[PDB]
């Protein structure tokens, strides 16, 4: 071992189980391990078993042995013979660690990966070299591939502003390397951001679950209103709203950024403590960091009224309207209003019962929202008896218009 460590061109990491070398090492390593193992455990638990882990550019093997040290079956790749020779030496000293090391290039290793081989892959301070060599677009395709064949990827990414010659080749924002992947979240920063990424699972600390589908817009036909700053992930029994407070390319203004904040805090305040006698979807998890915030809630069944109308579906307008008026009256009695009641925020189930979603639209201060509900009634459809209903409402003075009165009048023929 002694000789193998002199044979290293550089001592990059702490050498595992050998404090004699801790001054020679360029990187102290512990702060980043505690974040990596914290995520190892989360995903280990969610999968229900120990993990297969791929350590890309493993250096002197510190992170792979540290993980093998907890039942992980690891593979370590580095393109320097000297590095792996040290890795195996350390692995031989720890003989019951399931630990294997290969001399290889990340580009080829990733190219040859089959889906499921590894649950977790780790790429710390290595992709910048590859961006310099092969370019931004080639590295995005490597990382898409790597995310597709694993459940989770941890990356620590060098940034352009660093005073090295390869800095100029890097994108403006390190998020440019991973924004094409479905899910990403910043989990730390050192002296360099560290991201947890996945194309298969929502990875929040208390909510680690696969998703079947995700979208970068709220509904068919929403356009680009949120400038792609909100992501929506659909599981079996949940929906996760993930809002970025800040985006690459500077595209989100300060006001757009506040909008993402207010709307999310507000929804959480509401769903966390909803007014008695109001069936609101349950909060399964929520949190935020400096970059973003998230809310995970129970998935209501059915389809958006907007899509049912788009597909020309046969709907019961009486049942949709009554159920929707019953809950708007109910909210109103308890001092709440929804300021965005439109087809695309109404979910309709198989029995034609209608529920609101998008509860960040809730305000707690009436006629102006009733007025606007007439646009909704109009989008919904005037035949009778709904022409009479509406004229009955219009005989009252506008100041008197509210949802109790819309509902009362609607219950008379
Ligand atoms: N509880 C839920 N159950 C089922 N689907 C939901 C639920 N919450 C949200 N959705 C779906 O996710 C989409 C986005 O949700 P929502 O409309 O609440 O987000 P938003 O960010 O407020 O967007 P916008 O205000 O632009 O409509 C909805 O259009 C709907 O398809
Ligand atoms: C700066 S280090 C990072 C070490 C370790 N992941 C960490 O952060 O502690 C970069 C490592 O990646 C290896 N490396 C760089 N480019 C590589 C490539 N294309 N293929 C394989 N290994 C590479 C180097 O040999 C070196 O050990
Ligand atoms: Mg909506
Ligand atoms: Mg909304």
Numbering used by the authors: 5 to 195, 203 to 376, 383 to 398, 418 to 449
Task: Quote from the publication.
The chain length of the O9a O-PS is tightly regulated by the WbdD enzyme. WbdD first phosphorylates the terminal non-reducing mannose of the O-PS and then methylates the phosphate, stopping polymerization. The 82 kDa WbdD protein from E. coli O9a comprises 708 residues and contains three domains, an N-terminal methyltransferase (MTase) domain, a kinase domain and a C-terminal domain (residues 460–708) that includes predicted coiled-coil motifs. WbdD is an unusual enzyme since it combines both a phosphate-methyltransferase and a sugar kinase activity.
Removing this C-terminal helix (WbdD459) gave a monomeric protein in crystals (space group P212121) and in solution, confirming that the helical bundle drives trimer formation. The structures of WbdD459 and monomers of WbdD556 are very similar [r.m.s.d. = 1.5 Å (2538 superimposing atoms)], but there is a rigid-body rotation around the hinge connecting the N- and C-lobe within the kinase domain, accounting for the relatively large r.m.s.d. WbdD459, which lacks the C‐terminal bundle‐helix αV, showed a marked decrease in kinase activity but has lost the preference for 2α‐MB over d‐mannose. Thus, the C‐terminal bundle structure is clearly important both for biochemical activity and for polymer (substrate) recognition or co‐ordination. Of our structures, the ‘G-rich’ loop is most clearly defined in the Wbd459 structure, where it fulfils the same role as in Src; co-ordination of the AMPPNP (ATP mimic). However, in WbdD the loop protrudes further into the ATP binding cleft than the corresponding element in Src and it interacts with the catalytic loop through a π-stacking between W355 and Y230. WbdD binds ATP (or AMPPNP) via two Mg2+ ions (denoted Mg1, Mg2) that are co-ordinated by N356, D369 [part of the DFG motif which is almost universally conserved in kinases], E274 and all three phosphate groups of ATP (or AMPPNP), as well as by two water molecules. Mg1 bridges the α- and γ-phosphates, Mg2 the β- and γ-phosphates. We therefore attempted to co-crystallize WbdD556 and WbdD459 with d-mannose (KM > 100 mM) by soaking our crystals in saturated d-mannose solutions (∼ 1.6 M). Only WbdD459 crystals (with AMPPNP) withstood the treatment and gave additional electron density (not present before addition of d-mannose) that we interpret as two mannose units, Fig. 6A. The pocket is occupied by sulphate in the WbdD556 structure, these crystals were grown from ammonium sulphate solutions whereas the pocket is empty (with the loops disordered) in WbdD459 crystals which were grown from a non-sulphate-containing solution.
